[PDB]
Nucleic acid binder design. Structure first.
Length: 803
RNA sequence: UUCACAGU
RNA sequence: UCUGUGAAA
């Protein structure tokens, strides 16, 4: 429970496919970096001014200390140098005057790049983290000051108007990653909304829709002024009549020709003076547009007013405000390019890159290749999908997609008793709408092998979440064992949360919500997917993996776990699900409420205990193996999460029986990264987005130099560029081969019951996500109060309500 | 709240 | 959480 296993071997399954990865080979020396800690006071100033302070500190004491060395800075306390500094362990104290700060700097440690080279080779088993971090600081130093940092991406002005004084800025993500033999620089592109570096007058011309400012010869109306105010308030501006930056707190009601302030004269006496007057006398600036209001800057009652024609919107402030759908449309154009388009963008960026010409990068003897890394991937064979009925039809996924035509559920549920609760206006969702929807739904359901062989025994209109529980209870007594309540919803509303709370937690009634728009106008696809959900919620089995096509791990009892934690931007929600049959199709769910933004699953031992117990209840077997798919953890959390959670799983096992120790395979699933894969050959591109084919597997060249990880793109890219899921094996008692684990994961991506498609992550993980989200919906109304708020009814525990 | 994918 | 695309020829 300490060190992740080494890669057992390399996969050879599937067919080869030529790929390009947005990893760029790095040339890294074997010298020793010197790591110093900086303690600068005052310590609460922003990062970029820290970088300015450090920079001036460096170029000031050149004769004395730093000399020819160009140190890099992470923006906080960490400094790195290629050559040693005239330093000891003792903190040396300096003072730097910025156009005054104390700067304490001491020697921390030597960072060996030789040991890193060893880690890339077969010399060392582990990759030293502070080497990677140091390298990252080296590569990020200059672009942190030259560009505008958003998150860990660097953004800049294009060469892209958005309207409303807003524009698209283009940026790139950059990160140093360890790979086999060589270090890699992962680069991706992105775009976001910024405010233009234009004069405030141009800004009002764009916000108030003026071609020329001469359009408004008269003062602004209250409406105009209010819109402009709510658009510019909070934004920083800079003056052009001296320089100084100000933050706008309000816009004056009065125009500059009438807005007054208490002018403090040389005598010490105050006299009320208009802004226009002051700018005419003091700055000899006759305002060309005195009929416009002023920007109130500074704070509160300091009466600092700036006329519009002397202010510019400062560059580098991203627009977080929601945008117009036109602006959002062009935004979509920019941010979600097709795979070849993104490929070409990255390629262009790196063919015109600044890394090799960066003085700080060259100081540490680093070089970066211009071309993407050529990688050979493997497209895995998709599993066949077995259905039921008399035909027992078998579907073959083509490009990660199949359908239900001429196919019936492996185990369809006969729906005898069901009701309809319409929370939409009757005059808007009429009776004939409900009737037509009903007969069409019955047609589709009968075709799918889930026969709704009768009209609803109940069908009423309603309004108010407060009406949900009294009705549902009424439905629970009036009608002997209904199976389903279909609830029609008029868009986003609290009654959905209430319906799920009442149905799942307090009564144990299966409920299926349908939005109003999908009742008025229905499509066979929508009805079919709806039937997938309904059949699953009633205990049915939509389909199974072809038994003979399963990997040999299924020759012995095995449980598949999925785990996820969702956090508030207010407790965190942990969810763990587990397989309950050998197909594997049906899953049981457990969920806990826990500490605010705690990523470690606190009550994992108990949850796993419950799941194992339920597994034995369902299969009459104890699992010989436990496959644990953990979602949403970063590498920085790997050791902690692995430690506590693997100990928790083993704890559950040993607290169930004395000598019961099944093999545990701990696998982290991550969809949030910047790895992009492209088809080298144009004829391998799939669809209009031109993405790699579903089942594309990569476990070479860009993966970890020693540990057991791989990329799997199991889904078909519909729009933009696909995001291949990454899998990192933190533990493996079962000694999986790469092929078997990759194939297993891929097949598990075909067991997701809400669609006849291969999804991006294995069904366990996805289900865990769904469970956590549902729990979030259960908490809409004390720690243990919240705990029993997410605890489902007894008649729900053995169900797949989260579907 | 038919669903998946993709952006933030 | 929102936003977008997709389930013509």
């Amino acid at each position: 429970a300490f060190k992740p296993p080494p890669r057992p071997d390399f996969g050879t399954s599937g067919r080869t496919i030529k790929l390009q990865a947005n990893f760029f080979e790095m040339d890294i020396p074997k010298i020793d970096i010197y790591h110093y800690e900086l303690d600068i006071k005052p310590e609460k100033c922003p990062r970029r001014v820290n970088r300015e302070i450090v920079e001036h500190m460096v170029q000031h004491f050149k004769t004395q200390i730093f000399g020819d060395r160009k140190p890099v800075f992470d923006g906080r306390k960490n400094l790195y140098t290629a050559m040693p500094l005239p330093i000891g362990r003792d903190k040396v104290e300096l003072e730097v005057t910025l156009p005054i700060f104390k700067v304490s700097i001491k020697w921390v440690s030597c960072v060996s790049l030789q040991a890193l080279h060893d880690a890339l080779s077969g010399r060392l088993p582990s990759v030293p983290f502070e080497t990677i971090q140091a390298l990252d600081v080296v590569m990020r130093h200059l672009p942190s000051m030259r560009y505008t940092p958003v998150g860990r991406s660097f953004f800049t002005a294009s060469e892209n108007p958005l309207g409303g004084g807003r524009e698209v800025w283009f940026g790139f993500h950059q990160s140093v990653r360890p790979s086999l033999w060589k270090m890699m620089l992962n680069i991706d592109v992105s775009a976001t909304a910024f405010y233009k570096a234009q004069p405030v007058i141009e800004f009002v011309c764009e916000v108030l829709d003026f071609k020329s400012i001469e359009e408004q010869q008269k003062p602004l109306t209250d409406s105009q002024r209010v819109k402009f105010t709510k658009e510019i308030k909070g934004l920083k501006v800079e003056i052009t009549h001296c320089k100084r930056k100000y933050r706008v707190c309000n816009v004056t009601r009065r125009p500059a020709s009438h807005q007054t302030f208490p002018l403090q004269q040389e005598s010490g006496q105050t006299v009320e003076c208009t802004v226009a007057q002051y700018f005419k006398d003091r700055h000899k600036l006759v305002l060309r547009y005195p009929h416009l209001p002023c920007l109130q800057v500074g704070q509160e009652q300091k009466h600092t007013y700036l006329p519009l024609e002397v202010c510019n919107i400062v560059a580098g402030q991203r627009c977080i405000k929601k945008l117009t759908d036109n602006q959002t449309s062009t935004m979509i154009r920019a941010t979600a390019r097709s795979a070849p388009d993104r490929q070409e963008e990255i390629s262009k960026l790196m063919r015109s890159a600044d890394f090799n010409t960066d003085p700080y990068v060259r100081e540490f003897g680093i070089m970066v290749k211009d071309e993407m890394t050529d990688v050979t991937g493997r497209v895995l064979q998709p599993p066949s999908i077995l259905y039921g009925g008399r035909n027992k039809a078998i579907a073959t996924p083509v490009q990660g997609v199949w359908d239900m035509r001429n196919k019936q559920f492996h185990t369809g549920i006969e729906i005898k008793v069901w009701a309809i609760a319409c929370f939409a206006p009757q005059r808007q969702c009429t009776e004939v709408h409900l009737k037509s929807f009903t007969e069409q739904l019955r047609k589709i359901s009968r075709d799918a092998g889930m026969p709704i062989q009768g009209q609803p025994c109940f069908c009423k209109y309603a309004q108010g979440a407060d009406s949900v529980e009294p009705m549902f209870r009424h439905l629970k007594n009036t009608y002997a064992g209904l199976q389903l309540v279909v609830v029609i919803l008029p868009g986003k509303t609290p009654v959905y949360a209430e319906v799920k709370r009442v149905g799942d937690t307090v009564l144990g009634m299966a409920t299926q919500c349908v939005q109003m728009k999908n009742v008025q106008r229905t499509t066979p696809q929508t009805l079919s997917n709806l039937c997938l959900k309904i059949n699953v919620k009633l205990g049915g089995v939509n389909n199974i993996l072809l038994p003979q096509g399963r990997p040999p791990v299924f020759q012995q009892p095995v449980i598949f776990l999925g785990a996820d934690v969702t956090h508030p931007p207010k407790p965190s929600i942990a969810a763990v699900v587990g397989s309950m049959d050998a197909h594997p199709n049906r899953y049981c769910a457990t969920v806990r409420v826990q500490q605010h933004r705690q990523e470690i699953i606190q009550d994992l031992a108990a949850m796993v205990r419950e799941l194992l117990i339920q597994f034995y209840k369902s299969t009459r077997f104890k699992p010989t193996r436990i496959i644990f798919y953990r979602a949403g953890v970063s590498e920085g959390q790997f050791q902690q999460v692995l430690h506590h959670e693997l100990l928790a799983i083993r704890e559950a096992c040993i607290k169930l029986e004395k000598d019961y120790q099944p093999g545990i395979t701990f696998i982290v699933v991550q969809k949030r990264h910047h790895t992009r894969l492209f088809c080298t050959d144009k004829n391998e591109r799939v669809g209009k987005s031109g993405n790699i084919p579903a089942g594309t597997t990569v476990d070479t060249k860009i993966t970890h130099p020693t540990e057991f990880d791989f990329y799997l793109c199991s889904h078909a890219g519909i729009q933009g560029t696909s995001r291949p899921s990454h899998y990192h094996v933190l533990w493996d008692d079962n000694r999986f081969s790469s092929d078997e684990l990759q194939i297993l994961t891929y097949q598990l991506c075909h067991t997701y019951v809400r669609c006849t498609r291969s999804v991006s992550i294995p069904a366990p993980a996805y289900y865990a996500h769904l469970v956590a989200f549902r729990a979030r919906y259960h908490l809409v109304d004390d720690h243990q109060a919240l705990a029993k708020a997410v605890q489902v009814h007894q008649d729900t525990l053995r169900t797949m309500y989260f579907a």
